């Protein structure tokens, strides 16, 4: 019954992974219709930051050799015209490098074997020109998407394994995967936004969490566990920079378990060694990115290591609150002093944009930079609609009941005031997961898009309902009752998710890009609003100045100079700014110059940080008249070189 149980667990985990893969692939094909889309139309299908990430994969796959392509992307001079950036460690383009390195020999060997891995045929659109839509794994878009979706299908398997581990039964894993499937809409968006960074990294984060829970539960240690933890920590760190903050909230949880004597010395030593090695390897592979230091993930590693290694000196302590308070003070003080001892100390001055959004939510910090995030409706507070939708499937009540049950059992099977440094308190993995859930819930409430962390942890915590420790016939007959009532309110969400189809494109941007193909030189420099620039670089291969990945330092002031053409600045000043940056064309929309909810239109975001220039006629008040009157009289040095159906306007810098 022990070989049979474990083998069935393994098999069912693999099956749910495959089912999740097929489900997301179906939702993608229903959303973006790549089957009957041309290669250049699929590129336009990747809006804002996805077009920038895919463009470097396209760059590498078209290079004469892989080394030349990676040399192109490490000494890139096109993404930001004016200096030479290394985009590999700068946008986290390791998934693109790996996928391109795998794709090139694949196609090269396909030609030798004469395999027809790519199948396609002429397709006609009607009013527009005929195009070619191409199928097969040999197509580059499909190779990229298949890699993404194979990685993202294992999230369900990791959730199944975590449900089994935290409850020690198969009913718990079933409850977790069922709650993940019936709330699949809120858990992930890899169907809608495949090339995003979170789509490549979150599977590795949840795999790392599962491995850590396994290591804690069975008190494992040694080299073979350091390898397993590092092999899932390094890929997550290379991808998504934000992974570091995730790995911070993990450490904050681990400490809280350790301070309650639920983790032995050797296991905690193994865990911290794995983090040390993974951080070192990630720092090396990212070419010594000075951002990794002065984050919260490195000081936390050092602080937790110090607390672990000075723990045996405190064996004789007996009053538990004093011990916990002492270790908490040491942890917070060491991590904070190391952060400020490197930011405002050695003058490394990391990127503080996480803290700029948070200060604007509670205080009155306006900061046009933050206004570009706070009105985006994805760096806003969680909406009541999401909460009601999570309560509709009864996910929140189930996790809440499991949480209160765990609190009851923990408080009434452990001496709170008096501790023995020789007795481990048991059930540390459950406490670790509960604290991780609390951290993820705080993050998800503050900034929506961090719900990708909260919802699977809600599923894992709801999986606690099948823990036998905390009559067989009564237990099995009521667990199936819960599974049945879950099916009654989760099938509608699956059906509704599968019965939605996306809009059918728009011909404006294709016409603009054709005009740019034919009426501009290949080395022209372009400026404009951030979503358009990534598309203008992906296809049309023109050098640009500003791009959507505005996070780091070196592009932040460039956007504030570029978007000054929507301000109340004089024509001469903006023309001189454009000339100094060295752009030839400026591309924008008339829906970017509209006038209900001030402080998120550019005409109102330029009065908070430019109050001397209020009262003078706005530049958009001149563009929306120079396009209508069809003459570029009032804008003397500006010429409206492209205008069609009053949607896209391309001005040319004299």
């Amino acid at each position: 019954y022990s070989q049979t149980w474990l083998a069935s667990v393994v098999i069912i985990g693999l099956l749910v992974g495959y089912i999740n893969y097929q489900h997301v692939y179906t939702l993608f094909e229903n959303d973006k219709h790549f089957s009957h889309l041309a290669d250049f139309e699929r590129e336009m299908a990747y809006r804002t930051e996805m077009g920038l990430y895919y463009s470097y994969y396209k760059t590498i796959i078209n290079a004469p050799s892989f080394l030349e392509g990676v040399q192109e992307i490490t000494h890139d001079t096109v993404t930001e015209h004016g200096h030479e950036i290394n985009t590999l460690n700068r946008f986290n383009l390791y998934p693109e490098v790996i996928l391109a390195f795998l794709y090139r020999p694949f196609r090269a060997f396909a030609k030798s074997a004469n395999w027809q891995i790519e199948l396609c045929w002429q397709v006609n659109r009607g009013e527009l020109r005929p195009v070619e839509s191409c199928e097969g794994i040999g197509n580059p878009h499909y190779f990229y998407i298949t890699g993404v979706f194979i990685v993202a299908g294992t999230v369900a398997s990791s959730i199944f394994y975590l449900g089994v581990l935290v409850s020690d039964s198969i009913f718990g894993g079933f409850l977790s995967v069922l709650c993940f499937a019936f709330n699949h809409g809120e858990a992930t968006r890899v169907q809608w936004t495949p090339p995003l960074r979170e789509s490549f990294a979150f599977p590795f984060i949840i795999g790392h969490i599962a491995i850590l829970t396994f290591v804690i539960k069975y008190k494992k240690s040694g080299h073979s566990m350091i390898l397993l933890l590092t092999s899932m920590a390094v890929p997550a760190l290379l991808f998504w920079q934000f992974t570091q903050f995730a790995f911070f909230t993990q450490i904050c949880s681990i400490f809280l378990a350790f301070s309650l004597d639920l983790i032995p010395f050797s296991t905690a030593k193994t865990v911290i060694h794995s983090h040390i090695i993974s951080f070192l390897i990630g720092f090396l592979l990212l070419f010594g990115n000075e951002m990794m230091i002065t984050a919260l993930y490195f000081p936390s590693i050092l602080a937790l290591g110090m607390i672990i290694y000075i723990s045996p000196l405190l064996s004789n302590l007996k009053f538990r609150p004093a011990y916990v308070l002492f270790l908490a003070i040491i942890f917070a003080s060491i991590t904070l002093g190391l952060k400020i001892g490197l930011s405002k100390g050695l003058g490394i001055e990391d990127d503080a944009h996480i803290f700029d959004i948070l200060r604007s939510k509670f205080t009155s910090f306006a900061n046009f930079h933050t206004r570009l995030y706070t009105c985006s409706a994805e760096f806003d507070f969680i909406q009541y609609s999401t909460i009601e939708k999570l309560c509709g499937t009864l996910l929140i009540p189930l996790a809440l009941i499991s949480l209160v049950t765990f609190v009851f059992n923990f408080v009434k099977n452990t001496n709170l005031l008096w501790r023995n440094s020789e007795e481990i308190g048991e059930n540390g993995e459950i406490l670790y997961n509960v604290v991780q859930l609390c951290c993820s819930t705080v993050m998800a409430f503050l900034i929506m898009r961090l719900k990708l962390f909260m919802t699977p942890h809600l599923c894992i915590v709801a999986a606690l309902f099948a823990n036998s420790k905390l009559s067989k016939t009564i237990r099995v007959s009521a667990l199936v009752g819960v599974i049945a009532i879950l099916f009654y309110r989760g099938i509608p969400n699956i059906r509704q998710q599968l019965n939605v189809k996306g809009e059918y494109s728009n011909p404006d941007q294709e016409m603009l890009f054709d005009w740019i193909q034919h009426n501009t030189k290949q080395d022209a420099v372009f400026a404009g609003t951030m979503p358009v620039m990534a598309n203008v670089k992906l296809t049309t291969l023109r050098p640009i100045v500003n791009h959507p990945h505005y996070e780091h330092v070196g592009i932040r002031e460039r956007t504030l100079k570029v978007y000054s053409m929507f301000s109340k600045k004089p024509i001469a000043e903006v023309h001189k700014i454009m000339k100094e940056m060295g752009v030839n064309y400026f591309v924008f929309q008339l829906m970017n110059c509209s006038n209900r909810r001030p402080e998120c239109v550019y005409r109102g975001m330029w009065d908070e940080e430019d109050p001397k220039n209020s009262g003078r006629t706005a530049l958009c008040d001149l563009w929306i008249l120079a396009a209508n009157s069809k003459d570029n009289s009032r804008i003397a040095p500006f010429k409206i070189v492209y205008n069609a159906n009053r949607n896209y306007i391309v001005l040319k810098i004299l």
């Epitope: 064996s315 004789n316 302590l317 007996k318 009053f319 001496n415 008096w418 023995n420 440094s421 007795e423």
Partner: antibody, heavy 125, light 108 residues
Amino acid sequence: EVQLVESGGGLVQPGGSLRLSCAASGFNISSSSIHWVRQAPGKGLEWVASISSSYGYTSYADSVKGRFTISADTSKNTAYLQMNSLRAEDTAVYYCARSSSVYWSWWGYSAFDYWGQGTLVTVSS
Amino acid sequence: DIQMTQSPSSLSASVGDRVTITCRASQSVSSAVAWYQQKPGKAPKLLIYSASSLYSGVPSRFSGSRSGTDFTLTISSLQPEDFATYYCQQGASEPITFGQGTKVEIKR
């Protein structure tokens, strides 16, 4: 010199209640904890209840938890132990011992150094 | 939930004979144990705390040793005034629990 004195013992009826007092001279109370220990004829010594008056922490033994009550006030430098619903085994001599405050326990309670003399309480139907 | 077991319940030895009394705790309190002496009709008085630190005023013929969870109280030269009952207590947990209580008698 600091020293402990007890009062309130005697003879009572089973099922009744009684309150007894432990006063101290010298050191001010609320800088330390005080505890109650029973001694029965031919038996050993058994800790009963404890109080720290610095912020009002009270603890009991499960054998007497829910019936006995400890209330130590600082101005009079005295504490009160009040017991209700007397059983048939509560007949014993009580000692008011002194230990370190619980907030400063930190490696455990200090040894009972300055014991009280003790008062004998009896229950008989 | 924490308790002491004491094997030498009653020990009889002559005056001047070395006597050793043991104390074993079920849990693993580190060094938060103490020894006490009580005379019949009198209140107990503290002798040794922290399992090795002799108290002040008590004579220097009481020695306290600790090995792990075992503790031992030793008198090298038993004397007529050192005839009472002895107790062993821990203070590392909220239920403070003494020992059974050993007695020292006179050889005759």
